[PDB]
Structure 1
Amino acid sequence: MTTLVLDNGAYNAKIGYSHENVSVIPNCQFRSKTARLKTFTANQIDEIKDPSGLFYILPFQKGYLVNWDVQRQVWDYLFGKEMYQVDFLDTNIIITEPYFNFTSIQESMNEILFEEYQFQAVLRVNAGALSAHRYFRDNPSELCCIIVDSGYSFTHIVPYCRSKKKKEAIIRINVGGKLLTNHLKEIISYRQLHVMDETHVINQVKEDVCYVSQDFYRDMDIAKLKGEENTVMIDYVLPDFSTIKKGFCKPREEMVLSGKYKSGEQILRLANERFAVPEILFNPSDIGIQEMGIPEAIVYSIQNLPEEMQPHFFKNIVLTGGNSLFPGFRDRVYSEVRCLTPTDYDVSVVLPENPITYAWEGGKLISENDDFEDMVVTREDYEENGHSVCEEKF
């Protein structure tokens, strides 16, 4: 039989069955100021011929849930067609849950899942736990691993050892991809005008041009010196949905250094943001937050009890999420943890080759674990125990 693996958050709602449906389906609804205020669903955004000024209705604005209505509408619109083949009791679903989520909200979500959609089985596995299982299956010779999941709206430093997570050296950081996108928005707004509040185009510009600087102060000096010499001043032409529907970074050759083009686009752009907005993950607190970076917590998480886990912990660092898509992020994290951790202890940091849907891969690989029928809680068990069997099983 097939199963439906579901990961959910503020930016993305990745659902997928045993074989296909691998994509970046969002979780929020979109309202177009121009399309008569029509309320679009996760994948219906593709039907919008002009995503400029889309109002986002979010079930999650950060790690926790809000306004069930939106989540249930998204789930219904997804199931209603090819995505899941609404058949309910024929298959089962496996949903992820945040590191420390609302106990009441999560048990009520399980209640709704058992009652309304009536999946024959569902469980309380954790988003980090699924990635931990994936990594353990990839490397059976390993016994302990730390997951740095820097999602688009998440930053979790989660340990795992002996197939059990400890709730003491477990760190979360509020510096997420959404914060980075909002900071880029505010910077562009402040440096081109006094107000600018579009989100959809800048969220793409983020992943298109931003990169993690391997030498922050060197890049800062290169940006401080005049643009005639710097290389990070790559200009980005924004989309207008009338001549080009998707923005793009102009070739290094076509760049007119005067910053003005007779074509008439909003190409205006600066170099600083490109490498300033990603480094907030590594060296935060520059803007004012009391939030700590990635590496110091990657360190703090290791040195609690075990001198036998500490070495395996350094050797097994699993960087995943969505914020690890910028080039140089892996190298920077590796250099930082290598310079922060003891020399004698080995430190191996390896990000996968295609970690765009690592959670879906873990789910599709667990689909044939021959123990899911025991890991999962079923309809009758739920109805009889009343959330107790669900709290027991994860």
Structure 2
Amino acid sequence: MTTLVLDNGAYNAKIGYSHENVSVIPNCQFRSKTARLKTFTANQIDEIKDPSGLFYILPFQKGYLVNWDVQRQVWDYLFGKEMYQVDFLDTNIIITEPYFNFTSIQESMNEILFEEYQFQAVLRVNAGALSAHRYFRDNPSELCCIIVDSGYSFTHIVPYCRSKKKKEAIIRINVGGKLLTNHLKEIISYRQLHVMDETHVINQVKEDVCYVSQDFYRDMDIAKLKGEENTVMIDYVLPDFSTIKKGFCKPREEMVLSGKYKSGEQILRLANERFAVPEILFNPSDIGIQEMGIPEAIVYSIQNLPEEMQPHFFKNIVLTGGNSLFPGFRDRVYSEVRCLTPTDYDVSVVLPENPITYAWEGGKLISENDDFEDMVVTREDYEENGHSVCEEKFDI
């Protein structure tokens, strides 16, 4: 009857019903030193009041599901009586998978979904396929599109035709939100104060203060200055979870140059990390990763494809994922791609209002279609043909 759309990401699971809204819930368990024997599951992290020193139990290592017990527990909580009360025997599930998912992981997914839960039908796709379907629904005149999925654990770039994914031109960049957060942790620990146990707070700081610079060396020169002219430098007050619940940035008028404050607030001063961290997406070699950045990879992926299709792909660059929410990300990507693109070809980069939920919206749209029943694999057909037909139907 009903259809469940799930984006089993390594950081956030986009789970919701086709007839309802979308919810963003962390897809990992939590443990804290304020609880002796208590493991938090999924959105229960809101209950804790001192997220400092939080321990993360992740089901994904390097963007692929490797820990099955925590993932099973998270799914049981999400599918349980508390969250959604999913009727497994009469529900279809659309669940996303990482690109080039290993054969073993696919077999385990099929077995778990068809036996441990006994879903009526399963449709396993890629988040980029849903994003491409949503984009083609929004723009019916476009025949080809390229999807940029800058997520938690990686950044893929995949070009899609009207009804097919070009597996030959798929390029993966091993830079994601996890890497950026860890790099910011390492920088802050090495420079000002040890925060390697404060993943949550450093992630919030990155989400709040970091931005993509249009002119890297101009910003570096501005940051190197001292005094009023150092407009890049800002002061951040870390949350102590006693009187300051959440971190915030001090107003510029309230800034003190000397760095000493009468209030005993633990103030973390970030000047060049504001744009150094986001720059790793565009220049992986900045930190030591000998891989091409996002714009060069987009250009390479397009230029691998035949010449006739290239102008269409250059016109339909789509930015999805959490890392795409950096200020100036779209402008920087457009500028670099325009610099690299042939002048006769127009370049258009589109950043949706909610890049997090793009794949979930695409899944909702594809569920409503009249071709939905042909895409899914049923349990009755699973009994006999499943193990072959799951690989056959799904274009992973």
Q: TM-score range by the shorter chain?
A: over 0.9
Match of residue 134 from structure 1: 134
Change (3 A) 1:122 1:219: same
Instruction: Give the CA deviation at 1:166.
Output: 2.2
Instruction: Give the CA deviation at 1:249.
Output: 1.2
Instruction: Give the CA deviation at 1:71.
Output: 0.3
The answer to whether the Cα contact below 8 Å between 1:175 and 1:291 also exists between their aligned partners in 2 is: no
Instruction: Give the CA deviation at 1:386.
Output: 3.3
Change (3 A) 1:50 1:21: farther
Structure 2 counterpart SS, 1:367: helix
The answer to whether the Cα contact below 8 Å between 2:54 and 2:197 also exists between their aligned partners in 1 is: no
Change (3 A) 1:31 1:359: same
Structure 1 counterpart SS, 2:256: coil
The answer to whether the Cα contact below 8 Å between 1:31 and 1:40 also exists between their aligned partners in 2 is: yes
Instruction: Give the CA deviation at 1:22.
Output: 2.1
Deviations 1:110-137 (A, max 9, x none): 2100111111000221121111111111
For residues 287 and 220 of structure 1, what CA distance do their matches in structure 2 show? Answer: 16
For residues 328 and 81 of structure 1, what CA distance do their matches in structure 2 show? Answer: 42
Instruction: Give the CA deviation at 1:19.
Output: 3.5
Change (3 A) 1:121 1:194: closer
For residues 320 and 116 of structure 1, what CA distance do their matches in structure 2 show? Answer: 32
* Divergent runs of 4+, >6 A: none
For residues 27 and 241 of structure 2, what CA distance do their matches in structure 1 show? Answer: 24
For residues 192 and 87 of structure 1, what CA distance do their matches in structure 2 show? Answer: 52
TM-score (norm 2): 0.96
The answer to whether the Cα contact below 8 Å between 1:189 and 1:197 also exists between their aligned partners in 2 is: no
The answer to whether the Cα contact below 8 Å between 2:9 and 2:27 also exists between their aligned partners in 1 is: yes
For residues 247 and 62 of structure 1, what CA distance do their matches in structure 2 show? Answer: 29
Instruction: Give the CA deviation at 1:67.
Output: 1.4
Match of residue 227 from structure 2: 227
The answer to whether the Cα contact below 8 Å between 1:2 and 1:367 also exists between their aligned partners in 2 is: no
For residues 24 and 62 of structure 2, what CA distance do their matches in structure 1 show? Answer: 18
Percent identity over the alignment is 100
For residues 2 and 217 of structure 1, what CA distance do their matches in structure 2 show? Answer: 54
Structure 2 counterpart SS, 1:382: helix
Change (3 A) 1:37 1:338: farther
Instruction: Give the CA deviation at 1:250.
Output: 1.5
| Greater helix proportion | 2
- Gap regions ≥5 residues in structure 2: none
The answer to whether the Cα contact below 8 Å between 1:319 and 1:350 also exists between their aligned partners in 2 is: yes
Structure 2 counterpart SS, 1:203: helix
Structure 1 counterpart SS, 2:89: coil
Instruction: Give the CA deviation at 1:50.
Output: 1.0
The answer to whether the Cα contact below 8 Å between 1:156 and 1:171 also exists between their aligned partners in 2 is: yes
For residues 123 and 386 of structure 1, what CA distance do their matches in structure 2 show? Answer: 12
For residues 314 and 82 of structure 1, what CA distance do their matches in structure 2 show? Answer: 46
The answer to whether the Cα contact below 8 Å between 1:259 and 1:268 also exists between their aligned partners in 2 is: no
Structure 2 counterpart SS, 1:260: coil
The answer to whether the Cα contact below 8 Å between 1:29 and 1:40 also exists between their aligned partners in 2 is: yes
Q: How many residues align?
A: 394
Instruction: Give the CA deviation at 1:230.
Output: 1.4
For residues 201 and 389 of structure 1, what CA distance do their matches in structure 2 show? Answer: 45
Instruction: Give the CA deviation at 1:39.
Output: 0.9
Instruction: Give the CA deviation at 1:12.
Output: 1.2
The answer to whether the Cα contact below 8 Å between 1:158 and 1:169 also exists between their aligned partners in 2 is: yes
Deviations 1:168-218 (A, max 9, x none): 211001111100000000000000146743201111111111000011111
For residues 194 and 324 of structure 2, what CA distance do their matches in structure 1 show? Answer: 31
Deviations 1:232-258 (A, max 9, x none): 112111111110211111222222222
The answer to whether the Cα contact below 8 Å between 2:235 and 2:269 also exists between their aligned partners in 1 is: yes
Match of residue 254 from structure 2: 254
The answer to whether the Cα contact below 8 Å between 2:80 and 2:86 also exists between their aligned partners in 1 is: yes
Deviations 1:15-38 (A, max 9, x none): 111233523201111110221142
Match of residue 348 from structure 1: 348
Structure 2 counterpart SS, 1:303: helix
| Greater strand proportion | 2
TM-score (norm 1): 0.97
The answer to whether the Cα contact below 8 Å between 2:169 and 2:305 also exists between their aligned partners in 1 is: no
Deviations 1:287-327 (A, max 9, x none): 22112210111001111242221000101111111100011
Structure 2 counterpart SS, 1:81: coil
For residues 358 and 227 of structure 2, what CA distance do their matches in structure 1 show? Answer: 40
How large is the RMSD of aligned CA atoms in angstroms? 1.4
Structure 2 counterpart SS, 1:168: helix
Instruction: Give the CA deviation at 1:86.
Output: 3.0
For residues 288 and 233 of structure 2, what CA distance do their matches in structure 1 show? Answer: 27
For residues 132 and 43 of structure 1, what CA distance do their matches in structure 2 show? Answer: 29
